[PDB]
Structures are given as C-alpha cells and as structure tokens.
Amino acid sequence: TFAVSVGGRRVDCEPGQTLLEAFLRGGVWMPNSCNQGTCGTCKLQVLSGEVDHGGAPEDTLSAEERASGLALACQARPLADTEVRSTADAGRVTHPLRDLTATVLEVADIARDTRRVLLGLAEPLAFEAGQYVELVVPGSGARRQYSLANTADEDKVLELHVRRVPGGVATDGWLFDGLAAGDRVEATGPLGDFHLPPPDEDDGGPMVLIGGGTGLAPLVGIARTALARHPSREVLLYHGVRGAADLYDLGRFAEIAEEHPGFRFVPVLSDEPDPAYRGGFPTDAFVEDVPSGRGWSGWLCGPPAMVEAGVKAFKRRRMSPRRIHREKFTPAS
Ligand SMILES: Cc1cc2nc3c(=O)[nH]c(=O)nc-3n(C[C@H](O)[C@H](O)[C@H](O)COP(=O)(O)OP(=O)(O)OC[C@H]3O[C@@H](n4cnc5c(N)ncnc54)[C@H](O)[C@@H]3O)c2cc1C
Ligand code: FES
Ligand SMILES: [Br-]
Ligand code: NA
C-alpha cells in the first residue's frame, strides 16, 4: 500500500484503490458527488507523488489539467506515496464509507416506472440525509448510485426510489426484472455531499427543494431533517414529473404538511395535464410562487440538464450561489 494524505490526515491506499475510496473508508472527508468521474467535485492538486488517472474523462479532467498536476480523487490511484490538496475543509471527519450486508426487505411498484426498494442492514449505517449508496448489479459488475430517502435515525432499512430506464442495465435489467425480497445486494455507502450543514450552521432560513422524477428521493430525507430541526420553517418541495401517473407518496407529504405549516408539496406536470395539479416545469413553478430568491436556499436533484438549468434560474432570481445545492443523476453509461 501507499501512504496518501490530505489536510494533514494520512490513510493507506491499496495500489488498486482510488484516493477517494481510501480517504472515505478512513473517515477522512473530501468532496465527492458521483464516484464515477462525471461531477468533477473531487478534483485535487497532486502536491507530491504520482497517480494513474484511471478512467478520468477528458471533459472532467483535461490534458492541460493533468499536465499541471490535477487529478480526480475518484479516478486516481497512487503509484507512490502521494500528498494532495483538496478544498480547505477536506480532511475533516466524515461517516466512514463501508461495505454493507444488505438484504431486500421489500420491492414495490409505487408509480409509473417507479419502484421503492427497502434494503435491510445487518448493522446501523451512519450517514447524513441526502447521501447515497452505490449498488453493484449482480452478474454484471455495473455500479449505480441510488439516493437515500432516509432520515439519519432510519439507520437499519435503506429506502431507495428507482426510476426505470428503458434498456438500462440496473433498472430495466434487474431492479424492475428479477430483484426480490430476500436477495442479498452488494452495496457500499454512504457517499455524497448533498446534505444539510451541521445543525449549528443552519439558520432556519427558507428552503426550496426541486426533484425531477426520482430526484425526489434525497429531498424527502433533507426536508424531513430540516423540519425536525426547525418545525416552523418554510420548506417548498416541488416534484417535477411528466404526468399524474408518475406521482407517489402523496399521503406521506400530506401528513408532513399537516404538521408543518411552512411546508408545501407541489407536483408539477410537464407532459400530461391534470386539473388537480400545476403544469409545466418545476423550477418555473417556484419562480412563479417566489419571484425573488434572495435569502433562500435551494436544493436541486435530478437529471443533470434539469439541475444545471435550475441552478441558473435560481441565480437569475438572485438566490445566492453560496446557498444553492445540487445532486445530478448523471448516467453511468
Ligand atoms: C449521485 C447519483 C445519485 C443517483 N440517485 C438515483 C436515485 O435515487 N433514483 C434513480 O432512479 N436513479 C438515481 N441515479 C441514476 C442511477 O444511478 C442510474 O444511472 C439509473 O438508474 C440508470 O441506470 P441503468 O443501469 O438502469 O441504465 P444504463 O444501462 O446506465 O443506461 C441505459 C441507456 O440509457 C441512458 N440513460 C441513462 N440514464 C438515463 C435517464 N434518466 N434517462 C434517459 N436515458 C438514460 C444511458 O446513457 C444509456 O444509454 C443517481 C445517479 C447518481 C450519479
Ligand atoms: S468526479 Fe469524482 S466524485 Fe464526481
Ligand atoms: Br451492514
Ligand atoms: Na476530493
């Protein structure tokens, strides 16, 4: 193994192991949001040593950047003892990344092309609401990310919301065709940075959360966590789907709203109109409801283009860049 360090903290990395996984398995945090080379948030400066850049794509890590000594922690494997620089906060404690002993407790068809998967764990998992877990497709080897809908106290049964992708390896080929209660599932977690700041740094200000499709999943955990901390706070949760057939858990959100007068749940249908529901695209509905985003925080999760367009729309209505949070469901193939 090689010694790899960030922020004064050392871990030992096996030669076939990536920098990111070595650090998180040691409880040493650095930014990460996909573990597959697409989000670019794990970019590092190599200060000393040497890495193999692995499968790092050019659009995430250019030849120019490699020549200047940058790398992606989730793609880089050490070829010598290596010292790296991440962000200022890298090196702080985080929940350790670990291998899970996970068993399917339930798989339920909950909406058009949508399944809930409940995974029971042998041991409690420490995580922040909004983090995700990485599943391995049995027999295939493909790795795919699924956000937790859980609050952190729901630490023994992981809740996933899975959207069927036609022709998809993990969804069409397994989670929608074959997965059954009692199956063991290869999984590691937690991963990801899409979560609330520590309670001490949470001013209780208003939040808008926008989920495209099953991008709703981490927002369920984040919204419930935020409301537990500040029960009267304003939390606007928009669910952007094609039609009413895509909606789910309406009763659960209604119970949240009855308890929390600042909470609202707003379906937004883009393709199949329904008189009961707002039409259009979900970021558009928030802008209509809240014409000025100044002083708001915003949480966007879903397909990458939806997130990126939503971020820009938030900023044009003067929401502060510092308070905009993103989780992109970027395809792995
Ligand atoms: C951090 C992160 C968190 C995620 N959390 C969730 C979650 O909570 N719930 C969830 O359902 N998914 C989530 N995803 C997306 C998920 O990991 C898979 O990519 C998705 O389920 C499709 O995988 P697949 O193997 O079925 O399709 P693949 O076999 O990888 O793709 C099949 C084909 O369809 C294309 N494709 C892939 N995705 C889409 C898509 N949405 N729409 C249209 N075409 C597509 C692919 O490019 C490919 O050509 C997350 C992704 C990331 C990076
Ligand atoms: S590019 Fe490395 S975690 Fe996303
Ligand atoms: Br476990
Ligand atoms: Na990193």
Numbering used by the authors: 2 to 334
The authors write:
As reported in a companion study, we isolated a cytochrome P450-reductase gene pair, gcoAB, from Amycolatopsis sp. ATCC 39116 (encoding proteins with accession numbers WP_020419855.1 and WP_020419854.1). Unlike other known tetrahydrofolate- or non-heme iron-dependent demethylases, which are fairly substrate specific, the P450-reductase pair characterized here (GcoAB) demethylates diverse aromatic substrates, potentially providing an important advantage in both natural and biotechnological contexts. GcoA and GcoB operate as a multi-domain complex; guaiacol is processed exclusively in GcoA, with electrons supplied by the GcoB redox machinery. While the organization of P450 systems is diverse, the architecture of this 2-protein system, combining a catalytic P450 with a 2Fe-2S ferredoxin domain in addition to FAD and NAD binding sites, represents a new class.
